[PDB]
Amino acid sequence: GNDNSTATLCLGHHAVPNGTIVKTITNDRIEVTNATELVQNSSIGKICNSPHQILDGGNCTLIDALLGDPQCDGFQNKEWDLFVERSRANSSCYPYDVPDYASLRSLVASSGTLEFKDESFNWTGVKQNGTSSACKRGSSNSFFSRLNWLTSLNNIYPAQNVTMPNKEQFDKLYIWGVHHPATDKNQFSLFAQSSGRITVSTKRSQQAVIPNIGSRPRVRDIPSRISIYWTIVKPGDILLINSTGNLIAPRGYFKIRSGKSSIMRSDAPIGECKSECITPNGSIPNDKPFQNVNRITYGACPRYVKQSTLKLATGMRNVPEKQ
Amino acid sequence: GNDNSTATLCLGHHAVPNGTIVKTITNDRIEVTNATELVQNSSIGKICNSPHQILDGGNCTLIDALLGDPQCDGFQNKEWDLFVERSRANSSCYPYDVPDYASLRSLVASSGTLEFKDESFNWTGVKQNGTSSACKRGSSNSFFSRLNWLTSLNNIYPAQNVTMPNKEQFDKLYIWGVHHPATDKNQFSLFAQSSGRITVSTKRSQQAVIPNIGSRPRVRDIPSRISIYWTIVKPGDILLINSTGNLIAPRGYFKIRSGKSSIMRSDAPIGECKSECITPNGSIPNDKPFQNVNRITYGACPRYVKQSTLKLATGMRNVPEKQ
Amino acid sequence: GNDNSTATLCLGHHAVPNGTIVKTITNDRIEVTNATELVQNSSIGKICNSPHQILDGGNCTLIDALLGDPQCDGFQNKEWDLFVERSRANSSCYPYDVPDYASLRSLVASSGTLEFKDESFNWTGVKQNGTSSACKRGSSNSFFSRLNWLTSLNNIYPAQNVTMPNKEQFDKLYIWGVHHPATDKNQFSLFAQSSGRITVSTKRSQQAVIPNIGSRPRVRDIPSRISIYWTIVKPGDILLINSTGNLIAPRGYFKIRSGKSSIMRSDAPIGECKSECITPNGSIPNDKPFQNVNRITYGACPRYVKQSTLKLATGMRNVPEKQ
Amino acid sequence: GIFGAIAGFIENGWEGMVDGWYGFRHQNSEGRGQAADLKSTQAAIDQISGKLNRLIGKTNEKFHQIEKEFSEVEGRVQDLEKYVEDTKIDLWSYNAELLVALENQHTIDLTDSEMNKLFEKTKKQLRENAEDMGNGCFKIYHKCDNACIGSIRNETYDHNVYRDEALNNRFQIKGVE
Amino acid sequence: GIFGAIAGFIENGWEGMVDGWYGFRHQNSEGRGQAADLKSTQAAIDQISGKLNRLIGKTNEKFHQIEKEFSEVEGRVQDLEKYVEDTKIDLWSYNAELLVALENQHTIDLTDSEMNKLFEKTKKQLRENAEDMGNGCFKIYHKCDNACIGSIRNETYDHNVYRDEALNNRFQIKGVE
Amino acid sequence: GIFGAIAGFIENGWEGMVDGWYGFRHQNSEGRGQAADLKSTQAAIDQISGKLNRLIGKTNEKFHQIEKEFSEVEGRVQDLEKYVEDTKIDLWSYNAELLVALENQHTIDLTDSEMNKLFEKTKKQLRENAEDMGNGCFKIYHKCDNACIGSIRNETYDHNVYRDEALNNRFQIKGVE
Ligand SMILES: *[C@@H]1O[C@H](CO)[C@@H](O[C@@H]2O[C@H](CO)[C@@H](O[C@@H]3O[C@H](CO[C@H]4O[C@H](CO[C@H]5O[C@H](CO)[C@@H](O)[C@H](O)[C@@H]5O)[C@@H](O)[C@H](O[C@H]5O[C@H](CO)[C@@H](O)[C@H](O)[C@@H]5O)[C@@H]4O)[C@@H](O)[C@H](O[C@H]4O[C@H](CO)[C@@H](O)[C@H](O)[C@@H]4O)[C@@H]3O)[C@H](O)[C@H]2NC(C)=O)[C@H](O)[C@H]1NC(C)=O
């Protein structure tokens, strides 16, 4: 109440007129003089191509580039730390399918390298270099650039027996296929055999595919399909291709390795910023401990939480005056 | 003490003669004036049919109803939010097996809808609506109500070529089988072919099954088996069945969707209470944050913990008097 | 300050000139009078065989002992709680492969029992005890001790139709194989059939394997391979063997149970200690709550954490004297 | 007991309380009475029942999940499904044990602090009109009737009214010899 | 508020403060003044911003992971992949909620304790030269100018100089009757 | 340093103590001595080694688990097995870091409070016979021999015996002018 003789000395704390709401263990609603946000909830909206190398999938998908699709002709021996394939990709060549599409796509993405070194397979008494009317590069009939459609020559398809040992110090990737004809007439015209059979084996694992003749719905004016397999040859192993008939022979091997590369499905345009995380929504700042923009992340991204907001108390309780 | 002088003013805290033991971070045994239980350890013992729709599996299983078993004849186009199949289910029709039984059972349970709209497949020169002596509905020979056992007519089995475009806006479910004959004499009797072959394919995925002739142990007076596959046709796709022989043709498609439905194995009787969780032991109260009655739960059930008791201290430490 | 009239009494706490650094929630570097380590970062460097029974794999692998490899001839009906297979194991018999090697190896490890009781299969008009020149036991030609290589007698291979119903109360394990011949001449010489077929079926599940004739790379002077399947007969099923040829028939059943047994890959010098945890690096003390030596553990082992150091404060803040 | 107001200087607990948690006990020349402090117990009630509010009401609706019981034995993928479900249980078992341990310890310390500050608040009001025995009791040296005891109870007590009287009974003992 | 120095005996805050967190207010015969305590706020600043340092900067580089979105409906293996990813999200959601709750509660109690110990430290320095009004405000009885308050403000105050003077104003009221 | 009895008003530590954690130092006309309080250190010891008891002894017996190292490269199912095991390691890494952080902070606060209540308990026993210098030390104004100093040590001290003597040496300075 103030006086003239004695003194007075009080203690206090600073406060702000407009505080921030936070959540504690005992109070679901409590005011704090200053609070920060822990979860990221926004993105720049554009992918960024640094520091990790980012290859745009363009008009096709990874496996399409693995086969030599003319739409992915520009991916000739290209590496990437993240293959951003787009949802608008369309197959624009001879129809094909993979019995283990999920396994093959993830395996190639992990290597992150499309290095190709063609090898001279010793095919004898057969017409190699097969072409189809469903794969037009430069307005001319063609086929997959990484595959070899073997077709009988002079209406004769002698049985093959070839081998290709490994001298290198890495796991080679031989990718071959099996041609399923639509009709029995197609089987005899191309291959001159009532029923073919294939055996691709190594010293450790063996494979055997019997072609399944049968008419299938027309896609890209082609009623037949090709089923594409793959084999791994470690150093010290020897590959052996028997191939009585119906073989879409490989041409070389893909240099498989292991690293920090992967694949992602996204539609955000590529940019030029610097960011340590890539998500399908786009690059995000890499400072907040948590985030909720997208569960699929690449890089040193913050953890994903369901909660959209998490306020952390940085100041004391805000108890204003007046009122 | 007390006096005829100035004062005495003590402060205290309430307590009870019999407290409850709790566990803290520093004391494995400490008394608290009042504590609550956080883990649920008991069940009502009866499954309850509200608010989630619950369909009793009856005498058979989901896949048995998916085929048309007479024991499941009452499941004609029925939907459910939880299919409670019983352990006493017994197959009472033609013996069958599924190479991917786990995948097929989970897929149908997720849709939670047995809607069936038959389509008139264009089978020519063949005997449709085939029956069998191992499935007697009304004391008369019959077969699966959702399958069509094609058999050769006049000892002739012409090759088929049929199609079925998808014009709806949902993924159709065509379920077909292949008949494995017990003996070579059987293979000629119903099918008039030395060796059959089947090709069911769409624009995106293809399948091909060759029947495996061979005698198998007798169950329900039948030495043969039927293996049942399934195919999914998205809108804009088209189905194609080639079927040289041995095809257990489908009749229609099941309306596949996605929702909150699932399957569960249980033996508790069906009641009429209101509960938000269903477990094989039975419906449980939904108030306690944790539970340990059963790991398999459906609905908004509490989390499962190994500990059977977890006491939470609500009052202060209990320090009684006397003694 | 002292005097000669009044007294003086201060309070204090003990401290050490050299303390230990610890990490708290608010101080990444703070000194404590005494702290302890929580993560185990070292091992004895050797496995040891107490209290759990430990069987050394020796020169071969578990599946090699499952077939009768002469290298594992000493594993005749031996049980274990942990099969420590070695990285130097080399196959020393007829080359073989398993389509589900991962599944078969895990199943046998879980049972942890190589009990074998041979059953007299009734093979008629065929040569039993088929021997191969790729497996020398006692400098003489032999084959797998648990498999029976059926070969045609007098250039005649009658079809086989035999059973073996189950009377015991445990799941029998019939392990059989199919012989893939390298060349068509080999197929006729051994089995006298143009093309074989195999059918192993029970009342619950059925199997059918057609041999894949084809040349394969030479290992141990053998161009052919044997692919080994397996079947489980429950207490009440009846196994049925049905094959025109190419059958590497079983000799009995491996008694299957479930218990606290598993396989592990290691290279440590198995000893004579007693320890409740067995990691591939060795045996670790079982007192620290966490550890970081190896992610693969067997027994009551602590929990693997990435952190190599976690110091727990078991004292007070060390604020020293002087300075 | 991190503050010391429970099981510390207070010997025991008062079982004869039904109108609150923390209270008072006084004896005067005109009689003896008892009453509780509504403000103190209400504050501790909010910070105890509030923990129940945080625990109860979590939304964890889950409908379709992988199989957890197996009538067969297949191999690799069956082992993986069992390993995933078991790991989830083990992680949540530690989360439940840690949560109850922290909540129980904090609750005990919270009630301990809530009465240590009631003792401090009362002692501040009485100024040098009273002292403490070290057992939670006071000695108000003014000749306090029932009115002033209650006046202290709802936090209104002018110490200057009884200031010069209490100093006589605290320092002027036997007329300073 | 586990000590009671915030929203306890201190009734309201001081919005007119930009030069510190915890400070002083005084009025003498020569005027009224205000000044903050840089030592008290620095102790709480280090123990608050340090929590930001622990949270920010974690290295969790992950490059190749299982598929998390599906255009197919496969069955068993598709369900397991979804279940594993969903379980990871659910567990980390509880970890984030629990962590932010413990950090916020500890921070509030930390700042509350910092003012309680500043009041205790100030009271110790003044010895019996003054008292407390029960609202966090002392009542210095010495005939003091602007000099003492700054000296107390930076922890240097010899009570013996003003000891015998403050005794008359505290105990020798109206000449002990 | 939540309470302030460690690194607060106490300037330094005492390396010369082997018989306990918290102790006393006194000087009288008959000599200087030192002895520790067994009751205070035992209370903290039980609440310090108890945390060791909770951590050590957990039963988590696991025998059969999925494969964790791979000599081949399979594909989809191989990736899932690696993701599950890695996720379990990452979650348990955070659980260990959080647990050791909460335990260490609570440990430091517990010892800090255990000596703050020792100062409060001692001061309550002394009543107004002494004061404090603000560094954990008192001035027992009574002519205390060795017997009464140790009498306070094991909690037996009737202040009424030395009450009028201490008031003379504390308030009647130079005969009140
Ligand atoms: C077993 O059963 C199966 C299933 O039924 C059956 O397979 C069907 O076989 C028939 C023939 O017997 C197939 O029909 C043929 O398809 C050919 C091409 O027609 C399609 O492609 C045209 C070109 O499109 C391309 O080019 C344009 C640019 O020009 C571009 O935009 C497109 O994207 C694409 O790249 C397309 O124009 C055409 O569409 C016309 O026709 C359809 C259907 O009537 C109509 O809806 C459209 O509006 C439009 O008018 C179509 O999509 C081709 O070989 C052939 O057409 C020639 O022959 C017929 C008959 O002689 C003439 O009338 C016609 O003028 C042409 O000369 C014919 O249309 C059919 O697609 C198959 N279906 C499936 C599902 O596989 C098997 O044959 C049966 N038997 C056996 C033994 O297997």
Ligand SMILES: *[C@@H]1O[C@H](CO)[C@@H](O[C@@H]2O[C@H](CO)[C@@H](O[C@@H]3O[C@H](CO[C@H]4O[C@H](CO[C@H]5O[C@H](CO)[C@@H](O)[C@H](O)[C@@H]5O)[C@@H](O)[C@H](O[C@H]5O[C@H](CO)[C@@H](O)[C@H](O)[C@@H]5O)[C@@H]4O)[C@@H](O)[C@H](O[C@H]4O[C@H](CO)[C@@H](O)[C@H](O)[C@@H]4O)[C@@H]3O)[C@H](O)[C@H]2NC(C)=O)[C@H](O)[C@H]1NC(C)=O
């Ligand atoms: C390749 O090898 C396989 C495997 O060996 C082989 O397949 C076997 O084939 C033989 C015939 O060659 C099968 O045996 C036949 O089974 C028929 C039915 O018999 C069974 O069912 C009877 C009825 O049970 C039903 O009904 C009752 C109510 O009435 C109900 O309770 C039951 O639950 C069920 O629904 C049942 O009574 C009978 O059991 C009797 O016999 C067994 C065995 O002796 C005995 O243990 C019982 O106590 C009881 O007495 C049995 O379970 C039937 O066709 C047939 O019986 C007739 O023929 C024989 C021979 O002429 C007469 O003796 C008899 O009186 C009848 O007229 C016979 O029993 C056998 O089941 C097959 N095995 C397997 C594993 O599938 C192939 O043929 C071989 N070759 C080829 C080319 O594949």
Ligand SMILES: *[C@@H]1O[C@H](CO)[C@@H](O[C@@H]2O[C@H](CO)[C@@H](O[C@@H]3O[C@H](CO[C@H]4O[C@H](CO[C@H]5O[C@H](CO)[C@@H](O)[C@H](O)[C@@H]5O)[C@@H](O)[C@H](O[C@H]5O[C@H](CO)[C@@H](O)[C@H](O)[C@@H]5O)[C@@H]4O)[C@@H](O)[C@H](O[C@H]4O[C@H](CO)[C@@H](O)[C@H](O)[C@@H]4O)[C@@H]3O)[C@H](O)[C@H]2NC(C)=O)[C@H](O)[C@H]1NC(C)=O
């Ligand atoms: C389809 O194509 C495939 C692929 O090309 C083809 O398969 C090849 O077939 C040829 C024959 O046509 C195979 O070569 C034969 O291999 C036989 C054995 O030779 C190997 O084994 C020798 C023994 O090693 C064992 O014993 C020693 C101790 O003695 C021990 O240390 C070893 O570990 C092991 O246990 C080994 O010495 C030998 O190595 C010699 O030769 C190689 C190659 O020249 C050389 O690199 C070495 O330095 C060393 O000199 C080898 O590893 C055997 O049948 C045969 O040898 C006889 O015949 C030839 C030809 O008449 C004579 O010159 C020789 O003196 C012997 O009499 C021959 O070497 C070849 O291995 C196959 N390759 C694959 C990959 O499978 C198919 O035949 C084709 N056709 C069909 C229808 O399928």
Ligand SMILES: *[C@@H]1O[C@H](CO)[C@@H](O[C@@H]2O[C@H](CO)[C@@H](O[C@@H]3O[C@H](CO[C@H]4O[C@H](CO)[C@@H](O)[C@H](O)[C@@H]4O)[C@@H](O)[C@H](O[C@H]4O[C@H](CO)[C@@H](O)[C@H](O)[C@@H]4O)[C@@H]3O)[C@H](O)[C@H]2NC(C)=O)[C@H](O)[C@H]1NC(C)=O
């Ligand atoms: C998917 O569905 C299609 C459509 O049904 C099936 O295709 C049919 O396949 C069958 C066999 O399974 C075919 O039937 C036979 O085809 C042959 C046709 O002969 C060709 O070659 C001779 C060579 O001299 C020519 O003269 C002739 O013109 C043909 O080019 C012959 O083997 C058979 O014909 C003989 O026998 C019949 C017996 O009834 C007599 O009527 C004939 O006169 C002749 O003596 C026979 O016709 C059939 O033609 C195919 N249809 C079509 C439209 O191509 C697929 O098999 C089926 N696929 C699967 C996997 O299920």
Ligand SMILES: *[C@@H]1O[C@H](CO)[C@@H](O[C@@H]2O[C@H](CO)[C@@H](O[C@@H]3O[C@H](CO[C@H]4O[C@H](CO)[C@@H](O)[C@H](O)[C@@H]4O)[C@@H](O)[C@H](O[C@H]4O[C@H](CO)[C@@H](O)[C@H](O)[C@@H]4O)[C@@H]3O)[C@H](O)[C@H]2NC(C)=O)[C@H](O)[C@H]1NC(C)=O
């Ligand atoms: C992997 O690759 C190998 C190597 O190419 C393949 O092996 C070849 O298989 C083909 C068939 O697919 C063989 O070709 C045919 O083999 C037969 C040989 O006849 C044998 O039996 C008769 C019995 O009277 C004897 O007289 C004769 O000497 C042989 O022992 C015959 O069916 C064929 O020969 C007849 O027809 C031809 C037609 O051109 C005539 O020139 C002949 O004079 C004769 O009339 C024909 O030769 C071939 O021989 C095999 N090669 C080898 C080196 O063995 C595998 O099949 C393949 N495997 C896979 C899985 O792809």
Ligand SMILES: *[C@@H]1O[C@H](CO)[C@@H](O[C@@H]2O[C@H](CO)[C@@H](O[C@@H]3O[C@H](CO)[C@@H](O)[C@H](O)[C@@H]3O)[C@H](O)[C@H]2NC(C)=O)[C@H](O)[C@H]1NC(C)=O
């Ligand atoms: C084998 O099965 C087919 C169907 O898969 C049978 O077709 C059945 O044909 C009869 C003809 O009388 C249909 O009955 C009619 O149906 C409607 C009302 O549903 C109406 O037109 C009439 O009142 C009459 O009841 C019957 O519905 C139809 N079945 C189905 C499932 O649609 C066929 O007869 C069977 N046999 C053979 C040899 O194909």
Ligand SMILES: *[C@@H]1O[C@H](CO)[C@@H](O[C@@H]2O[C@H](CO)[C@@H](O)[C@H](O)[C@H]2NC(C)=O)[C@H](O)[C@H]1NC(C)=O
């Ligand atoms: C505090 O409580 C006491 C009683 O517990 C109140 O004392 C009463 O005061 C009224 C006037 O307000 C008198 O008429 C009564 O005689 C008093 N009762 C007794 C038993 O002495 C006191 O007023 C309360 N104070 C406030 C501010 O609510």
Ligand SMILES: *[C@@H]1O[C@H](CO)[C@@H](O[C@@H]2O[C@H](CO)[C@@H](O)[C@H](O)[C@H]2NC(C)=O)[C@H](O)[C@H]1NC(C)=O
């Ligand atoms: C605490 O601060 C006060 C001022 O707020 C200081 O007092 C001054 O002391 C100097 C000598 O050191 C004198 O010349 C000034 O006249 C004093 N100012 C006032 C307003 O009285 C005091 O010295 C400071 N103490 C410390 C230890 O730094």
Ligand SMILES: *[C@@H]1O[C@H](CO)[C@@H](O[C@@H]2O[C@H](CO)[C@@H](O)[C@H](O)[C@H]2NC(C)=O)[C@H](O)[C@H]1NC(C)=O
């Ligand atoms: C507290 O400890 C002191 C000594 O530290 C005890 O004082 C002794 O008391 C006995 C009788 O009990 C005398 O014979 C001794 O001469 C005393 N020793 C000293 C050094 O003065 C005291 O009794 C203890 N109090 C209690 C309650 O145990």
Ligand SMILES: *[C@@H]1O[C@H](CO)[C@@H](O)[C@H](O)[C@H]1NC(C)=O
């Ligand atoms: C009253 O205040 C005046 C200045 O207004 C001052 O000179 C005087 O000393 C003060 N008197 C007392 C008794 O405090």
Ligand SMILES: *[C@@H]1O[C@H](CO)[C@@H](O)[C@H](O)[C@H]1NC(C)=O
């Ligand atoms: C601040 O709080 C007041 C109420 O105290 C509210 O009306 C106002 O909208 C808030 N914001 C600002 C910018 O004043």
Ligand SMILES: *[C@@H]1O[C@H](CO)[C@@H](O)[C@H](O)[C@H]1NC(C)=O
């Ligand atoms: C002493 O107690 C009596 C009742 O026993 C009471 O009337 C009297 O006032 C008391 N005396 C004093 C001095 O308090």
